[PDB]
Symmetry: D2
Subunit: 116 residues, 4 copies
């Protein structure tokens, strides 16, 4: 699994469950091409977005749908979503974990990059 996303709820002390995550890859014409999407599990984790074969070099955007998450809990959040944009695999394949921590008016994201 070369790309994993894990989301926690800092406000409620739980995994952020059923969070929609959309991944895009910058195309030759500078537009964002859809790449992969999924939802976090009961543990707040999203595995299986992509494969070693599919996850080529490129600029990737990971958009976490924080707004729908809060609205489903009956909460009016500040942000529309949380975006993480990065260049991947520039010096050969790496494994990326994008960790996100959510509160209605704040979020943090961190990347863990490991050499497989």
């Amino acid at each position: 699994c070369p790309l994993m996303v894990k989301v926690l709820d800092a406000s409620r002390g739980s995994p952020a469950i059923n969070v929609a995550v959309h991944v895009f890859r910058k195309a030759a014409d500078d537009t964002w091409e859809p790449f992969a999407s999924g939802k976090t599990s009961e543990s707040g984790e999203l595995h299986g977005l992509t494969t070693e074969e599919e996850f080529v070099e490129g600029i990737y955007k990971v958009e976490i749908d924080t707004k729908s998450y809060w609205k489903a809990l009956g909460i009016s959040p500040f942000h529309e979503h949380a975006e993480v944009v990065f260049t991947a695999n520039d010096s050969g394949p790496r494994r990326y974990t994008i960790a996100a921590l959510l509160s209605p008016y704040s979020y943090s994201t961190t990347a863990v990059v490991t050499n497989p």
Copy 2:
């Protein structure tokens, strides 16, 4: 100032100085139109972005050029930039402070909405 942006360097323990920040407002056709911009001061703050008259309800995007910030310090960054996207709702007034805390492989952002 209805909108202020404050950027801190959480790795080196300083304000993030001379960081480029661009603000966009969402247009009817779903494209982003430039709205305000500037560079953070020695205190990491960017004041005077907009006026009460210009800052109407809508969806705003704040794009912080974190990549150039880290490269100017000789430090390899993870992100291409940091984006903060939010809806301004009248409510009330109010005044919005968008704070961003930067590390080479992480950032956090918080909104402070005061009377």
Copy 3:
């Protein structure tokens, strides 16, 4: 002011107002002795904790009563409090801002050390 503390509510998007903050300095016997204290203002800031003369090099502990803050809002908190422990080293001057960002089950803290 060589030492300032700023507390923000990351869950509700406001300054954390009227939060009790106690500062201690480490004594020779490894016990914590009270040094300064106060309650955050309407801006979430606590100014005037100490003076240049009183704030010598040493190990300092800042204890923020986050539990009472959340209970006053009717929100169940995880932590008993939030503690920030650090060494003040002359260096240079300098001026220290301890910022804390609070949510019911999380907090972050960053130090900003300016000239």
Copy 4:
């Protein structure tokens, strides 16, 4: 495993490996009694601190030795350590994950509480 600690390095984009973690429990006389200690693995995780039998109700302090971590990397950090203090199991056994994100001048901690 009723108590787990996971530590990430936000400055370097890696798990925080070999981080010392000390846990204390508030005693009857209001002193901190040593409870458990360990070091994070290559994945930045620390399992096996305690057991269901040992982890009774109480006020617990989890002290993460962030200073030694940074000093071992040759970095002068701001903080002496990162403390997390909380009341545990007040309404019966729960599983706690304490997640920490470290930078030389900043850290964040979050708790995930689940009902086993």
